[PDB]
Write a structure and sequence with these properties.
30% helix; Lysozyme; Glyco_hydro_22; monomer; mainly alpha; signal; Glyco_hydro_22_lys
Length: 129
Amino acid sequence: KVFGRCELAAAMKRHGLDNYRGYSLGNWVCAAKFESNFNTQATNRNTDGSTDYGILQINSRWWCNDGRTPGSRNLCNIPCSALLSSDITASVNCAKKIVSDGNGMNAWVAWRNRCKGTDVQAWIRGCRL
């Protein structure tokens, strides 16, 4: 499913992401925009053989099991395919563990390079939250 900007903002808010670990809602919407262009079905293969999955492009080397990333940990305890669902619950629950890991949202390259330090509030402007 390809989410609308405000539609995703509302879903993320409902799942407890607004201000989780100190990151305002605008940060999560910005990260999703640049990681997957709001598409739950996005996948991207990395040079190391791992693959990024879903709305928040969660990596198979540490977070989920895709059966083809040799020697990977499955820290969120879920198959990577679960992250491509139209229901963002699994992606949200796993993202919460990722962001608590120590590097915060810097774990997401697109957030660090395109969202960090920008006016993230613009991503939720106009939405009925």
